[PDB]
Design a binder for this molecule. Structure first.
Ligand SMILES: NC(=O)c1ccc[n+]([C@@H]2O[C@H](COP(=O)([O-])OP(=O)(O)OC[C@H]3O[C@@H](n4cnc5c(N)ncnc54)[C@H](O)[C@@H]3O)[C@@H](O)[C@H]2O)c1
Ligand SMILES: Nc1ncnc2c1ncn2[C@@H]1O[C@H](COP(=O)(O)OP(=O)(O)OP(=O)(O)O)[C@@H](O)[C@H]1O
Ligand SMILES: C/C1=C/C(=O)O[C@@H]2C[C@@H](CC[C@H](C)/C=C/C=C\CC1)O[C@@](O)([C@@H]1CSC(=O)N1)C2
Ligand SMILES: [Ca+2]
Lengths: 355, 413
């Protein structure tokens, strides 16, 4: 009776019930070869494996295990008893969404389901149907411009640069400082340092002079064994990578430039609406200073008369999930569910007609 | 003069000029006001207008679209392509030897002779190469002679086929001929001649046409889908499985296996089988026309990294060093290699500085991958593992403040 909302990410699954204001369960998107924190409790005879890569499901057997674990272990429900809303990346291939649909109906025997675009859900969580979304997670970042509830596929930008790359970069530059962060467990520690101490500088070259000249930017962090370490310019060099991907050897546009490129690929008539509704979602948009920095970078690229607004809600770590919870619980959405009967009548390709 | 023009006016300057004068007068009747305007602007700003016509296609789609220089480029190109010759004609023009990757003087302008030394060096340099040409160019219907202007020691004598666009026009006292280059040049033969007391190299040249979509990625995508829709449905389940695995990111493992020479010293039957299937997929529907593709290379393909001092092509010394190392050389990729039918810059490789511009002979192994639903935004042509490319010529251009390189290359296997 109550619908399920399962937001499947490269790093984390966020799962819960439509109508709740937060996911009941958030757990790592890993299998052992065991799922989640079980997959690493016995990671000996086994190795941690991520089935979703850069936002796309790449292993269907492993993903079935993730979804198994979601229904039975995390939410403690029967799939046969709950319509289930799944999320997907922008530009998810059509064969992927067909395969998600097949698995839901033929493996899990759900009474109904639906597949929603993550960026559209996050926009909707703030009550908008028009805007440009920067969605940045553990594995992938997108710019998705949306006009009156429709994602605009020809203007979507994708960068394979996100939180896990930032973590790995932080391990490296901390190691160059004189520490040693290299193992899988140390990678978890540095993710934690990243999530607690990093920020985006408003003026990067300025910030690098300051730090070189004072201890004013230094912060301390206590390791699990009680060793306390110091972190300095690494705090802001780490997420600076989003704006300067050459920091990790990438020759792609940074997130400010992809946001501008995306807007420039849209019809000229709607660009002002996009500039006025830049919305951020996902864990990798949580850095203090990121909204101000994006404001400054986009101001430099755009016409001098352009009114630019960056919207970054405190909840934006879960705004895809929240959007799914709102959507799945709307009166006017109920006609949109794909029922098991519709699946029987029409193939997996029923997803394309209903979404 | 005869009633019908010759294919080559040779030294008959008086008839060439008169004929082209009548031709300029006839074509005036087919150009609308905007095209005539385009011609007038070209007369006034030819160098910059030609320069734009050579490198316009390498920027972001939206940067190209909003450049006001597009209007002149489009309107002039239309004026030219309209007026198609109905049988071949030979033309004459001087080039810098640098244009054909001879980066030194054949002789100085004050010298009258060319050494056998230089002659043979030039021959070895421009032999067995297909040189890509772009942009607007003024040519002569007659061979320059006593009292004609001759800016370099290299005269090109080019044969242009039927249906070549040529725009005859008058610029004050002079009768001219405009073309837009859109082909590759083969130099069939060079000879040393004498004009007005000085030795010149005369290059006997012909053209090779290729499909080059440049920034028109929609036209290129239509062509690709046109030719590879049933290739998509003719693969064995094994081949489709392995191609999709490759495309889905399996490429990194497969290609590293290949580059590290895994088949030799660390065989892996599972990977070998995939390599074979992908190759067989690429031989299933060979590239059905001569085609130009574009690849934005990582610096590691040319033995550089992001922080290599030698990757700063804003310094001419680094361009020279790159040319000395790579220009005229053949390079091999043990890996399968991705290219696009489009020349436009993209977000994912916006800052890459080395562009490969590759001529693919008809019937080469290859496939328009983007004919498979799922990820067609690449406009991708996958080339076979172990491909060899001859680097014919290295050009450079500015992308904002950043100097980037265009490597004119040819697939030779
Ligand atoms: N680069 C392009 O112009 C282009 C064109 C079409 C599609 N794509 C798409 O982008 C992705 C492929 O990206 P890519 O082609 O930039 O990655 P790639 O796999 O070709 O390159 C990965 C890295 O390895 C290097 N490399 C590749 N071959 C090498 C060799 N033989 N020796 C030394 N170094 C070598 C590259 O410089 C790069 O640093 C695919 O999804 C593909 O469909 C890229
Ligand atoms: N406060 C924070 N500051 C910086 N990064 C954070 C913060 N909180 C979480 N992250 C990072 O965000 C990522 C997880 O976010 P999210 O759950 O949105 O990604 P995902 O959906 O698993 O991945 P993707 O959307 O790329 O498929 C991790 O890399 C995590 O370290
Ligand atoms: C609090 C937390 C947040 C998180 O996002 O974890 C996700 C998932 C995690 C799986 C590996 C181990 C089992 C994690 C176990 C338990 C809980 C999740 C940890 O791999 C990440 O850590 C990677 C590596 S480091 C980084 O930047 N992304 C992202
Ligand atoms: Ca996500």
């Amino acid at each position: 009776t109550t619908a399920l909302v399962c937001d499947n990410g490269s790093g984390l699954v966020k799962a819960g019930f439509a109508g709740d204001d937060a996911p009941r369960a958030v757990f790592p998107s890993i299998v052992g070869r065991y799922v989640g924190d079980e997959a690493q409790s016995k990671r000996g005879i086994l190795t941690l494996k991520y089935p979703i890569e850069h936002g796309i499901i790449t292993n269907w057997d492993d993903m079935e295990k993730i979804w198994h674990h979601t229904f039975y272990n995390e939410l403690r429900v029967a799939p046969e008893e709950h319509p289930t809303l799944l999320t997907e990346a922008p530009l998810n291939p059509k064969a992927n969404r067909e395969k998600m649909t097949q698995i839901m109906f033929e493996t899990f025997n759900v009474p109904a389901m639906y597949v929603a675009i993550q960026a559209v859900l996050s926009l909707y969580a703030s009550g908008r149907t028009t805007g440009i979304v920067l969605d940045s997670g553990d594995g992938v970042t997108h710019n998705v411009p949306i006009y009156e509830g429709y994602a605009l596929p020809h203007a979507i930008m994708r960068l394979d640069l996100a939180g896990r790359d930032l973590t790995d970069y932080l391990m490296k530059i901390l190691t160059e400082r004189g520490y040693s962060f290299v193992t899988t467990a140390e990678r978890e520690i540095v993710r934690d340092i990243k999530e607690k101490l990093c920020y985006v500088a408003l003026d990067f070259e300025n910030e690098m002079a300051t730090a070189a000249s004072s201890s004013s930017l230094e912060k301390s962090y206590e390791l699990p064994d009680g060793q306390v370490i110091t972190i300095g310019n690494e705090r802001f060099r780490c997420p600076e990578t989003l704006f300067q991907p050459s920091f990790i050897g990438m020759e792609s546009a940074g997130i400010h430039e992809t946001t501008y490129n995306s807007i420039m690929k849209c019809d000229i008539d709607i660009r002002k609406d996009l500039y006025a509704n830049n919305v951020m979602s996902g864990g990798t948009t949580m850095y203090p200073g990121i909204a101000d920095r994006m404001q400054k970078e986009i101001t430099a690229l755009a016409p001098s008369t352009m009114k630019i607004k960056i919207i970054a809600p405190p909840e934006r770590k879960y705004s895809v999930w929240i959007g799914g919870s709102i959507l799945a619980s709307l009166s006017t959405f109920q006609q949109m569910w794909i029922t098991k009967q519709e699946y029987d009548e029409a193939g997996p390709s029923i997803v394309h007609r209903k979404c | 003069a005869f009633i019908e023009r010759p294919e080559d006016f040779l030294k008959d300057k008086e008839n060439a000029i008169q004929w082209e004068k009548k031709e300029a007068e006839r074509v005036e009747k087919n150009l609308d006001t905007l095209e005539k305007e385009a011609l007038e602007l070209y007369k006034k700003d030819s160098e910059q207008i030609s320069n734009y016509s050579q490198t316009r296609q390498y920027f972001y789609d939206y940067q190209i679209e909003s450049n006001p220089r597009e209007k002149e480029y489009k309107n002039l190109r239309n004026a030219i392509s309209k007026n198609k010759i109905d049988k071949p004609i030979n033309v004459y023009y001087f080039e810098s030897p640098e244009k054909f990757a001879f980066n030194k003087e054949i002789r100085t302008e004050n010298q009258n002779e060319i050494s056998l030394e230089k002659f043979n060096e030039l021959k070895e340099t421009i032999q067995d190469k297909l040189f890509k040409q772009d942009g607007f160019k003024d040519v002569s219907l007659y061979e320059p002679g006593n009292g004609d202007e001759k800016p370099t020691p290299l005269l090109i004598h080019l044969k242009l086929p039927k249906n070549t666009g040529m725009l005859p026009y008058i610029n004050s006292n002079d009768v001219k001929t405009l073309i837009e280059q859109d082909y590759s040049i083969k130099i069939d033969k060079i000879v040393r001649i004498v004009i007005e007391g000085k030795q010149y190299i005369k290059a006997e040249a012909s053209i090779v046409n290729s499909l080059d979509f440049k920034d028109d990625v929609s036209k290129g995508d239509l062509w690709g889908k046109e030719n590879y829709s049933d290739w998509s449905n003719k693969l064995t389940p094994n081949e489709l499985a392995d191609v999709n695995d490759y495309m889905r990111g399996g490429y990194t493992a497969i290609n590293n296996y290949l580059i590290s020479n895994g088949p030799l010293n660390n065989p892996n039957p599972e990977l070998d089988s995939k390599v074979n299937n992908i190759e067989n997929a690429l031989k299933l529907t060979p590239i059905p026309s001569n085609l130009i593709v574009y690849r934005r290379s990582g610096p590691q393909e040319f033995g550089l990294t992001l922080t290599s001092p030698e990757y700063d092509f804003n310094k001419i010394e680094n361009i020279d060093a790159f040319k000395e190392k790579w220009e005229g050389k053949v390079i091999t990729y043990p890996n399968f290699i991705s290219t696009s039918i489009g020349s436009v810059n993209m977000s994912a490789f916006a800052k890459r500085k080395i562009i490969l511009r590759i001529n693919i002979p008809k019937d080469s192994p290859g496939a328009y991958l983007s004919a498979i639903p799922g990820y067609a935004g690449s406009y991708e042509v996958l080339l076979n593992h172990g491909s060899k490319f001859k680097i014919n010529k290295v050009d450079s251009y500015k992308d904002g403040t950043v100097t980037k390189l265009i490597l004119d290359a040819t697939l030779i296997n």
